[PDB]
Amino acid sequence: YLDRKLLTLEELGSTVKKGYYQMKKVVKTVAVKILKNPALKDELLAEANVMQQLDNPYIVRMIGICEAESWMLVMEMAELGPLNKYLQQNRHVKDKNIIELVHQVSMGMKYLEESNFVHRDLAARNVLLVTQHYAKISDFGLSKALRADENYYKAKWPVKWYAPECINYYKFSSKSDVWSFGVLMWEAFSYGQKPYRGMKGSEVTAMLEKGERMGCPAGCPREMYDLMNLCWTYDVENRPGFAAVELRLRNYYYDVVNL
Template sequence: MPPGVKNVFRRSALCCARTWATSVHRFWVTDSFLLQKGWSPGTQCVTKCDHSKPKPSELAYRKGDMLTIIEAGVGKGVYRAQHNKTGEQGLISASNVREREAIRVDPSLSLMPWFHGKISGPEAVNKLQPIEDGLFLVRESIRHPGDYVLCVIVGQEVIHYRVIYKDNKLTIDNSKFFYNLIDMIEFYTKNQGALATTLQKPKEKAGAKSAEVELSKAGWLLDIDKLALGERIGEGEFGAVYMGHYMGQRVAVKDIKSPHLVGNLVNFLRTRGRSVIDTGQLLRFALDVCAGMEYLESKKLVHRDLAARNILVSSDNVAKISDFGLAQTNPKTSDNVKLPVKWTAPEALKKEKFSTRSDVWSYGVLLWETFSYGRQPYPKMSLKEVKEKVEQGYRMEAPENCPTRIYALMRTCWEMDPGKRPSFHKLREKLERELSCYSTVTRS
């Protein structure tokens, strides 16, 4: 396996889950329906209970294990299946398993459920209950803006480790450096390093759910040991792509050059905030994305999923567009995909009319995300409310401290008539002028 692929594939499982869900099984249906229609060989299932004392010819499993259907019609509601982890085969009852569900969008899912934002040391201590060795959380440092604090229980006390933000990297002891908090936490869950203990259990922020745990429950965390890599089939800006096989299915695996990427724009903005990222940097991010979209515009490509979550930030703070899973060269073609409502233009939601100008609408939302430092668009509004109110003329208010001219740009992106929205070329010109003005003011 090429260097970096194993680690990247594991990390990328969360990002790739949607694609896998689409290519394998899109919908979950009831057991009764499945008993009538039957599962075809290759169907992935998750066990609903323990079956630790199987009869001869039956398969043993624990609740939450992943199984693959090998043969249907062995008996009424009985299938032959293979255990994905052990490789053992045997008979199972359909009533004890459920088909692996498609991924559903849940705004409470987080890759950093242990990140509690700007809270004080005493607040962190109060949250780290009940007392348990290795229980931890991460907070923004109030005393040292721009830095973080890792709070972990050792014995009966909470130890606070200052995480210093230095040269676009994070460090606790000036000997081990990380590009982001996720990498740091992953390292210290496996290595004690400079800490008094390894990190054992995250204290999740109220209302947050671990994306890793939820995807695991749904059966979408991939077992790297089951991946077999084949020939190299492509090369992208962020790494090579290889043909592979996973549990009998052909897959594509991207070997991302992870040391040069520090995460997506949403997480980057949320974990650094106003104390680290100034308006000039926000303008540069906006300009980077706009320039990339201008290129797509020139090639008559429609992205259809432009959002801050799909923008990667390099180690030298350059924003780059990613996730072209919904991109089209023929925007008139209907493919019945589930669209990101809060980012999609009204004409695209109602009539599936996609164009570069519908991407411009999405870019306006991305601008709002950027200048709100990663906030969720249309906060506290349901998807139904967003659709209805936007159709009626509602537009989001300007983010706090957002430059007036940038908010005016957002509003032009959100014109109801697509023909009145600016091109990416025009947007780039205006952003360049705005950045130039900002630089002149800050130098004087």
């Protein structure tokens, strides 16, 4: 519970403002999600409740909650902003760099999977860059802590990022997040292009059910595209977990640096 007088506010995305929170001696730049007036309070608090439990270098950190002229969720600042926007405007970025960033996302998700949390909104728009070589996962407003005895959560949806079982059965798991990571990787290697351009969710469902998948982005290393298709395994049971996705990305990436 943060002290309102130790917070100095400057909009970014609308309600989100850059600010500064005085720590013991140094000021920390922060991104403040400011909430404006029914039960949307419970939602922000649920999001804060989730973020409070998480501690990983590849996940945005929550500084705290500030109750004041508005409810505010105070988080660390990722200055370079969303992964898709950054790539849309930085086409010189090397596939080596993209591999690096998506690997970082896979480590954060590996941790989230260990923590038994489902993100449920994993997309390139929700990966924030600290630097060109440092990505963090953000936006936990749809996230769920799984019960100790279950491996899925049963429920507007970003259908283009959703696995078949989410659509068909409303079942969200870490494997469902793996499907979304697949779409995220396609986004990254398409330098922030939107997936399934021009299609309605229902048409996307129809495409995937015919077994069709988005093609290999221009200049995307073949082994990366194969990873995407593995993320897009229809059957949840046969789809890999983030342990296996992260492991494959790590291996490949250091066969890249090493060379």
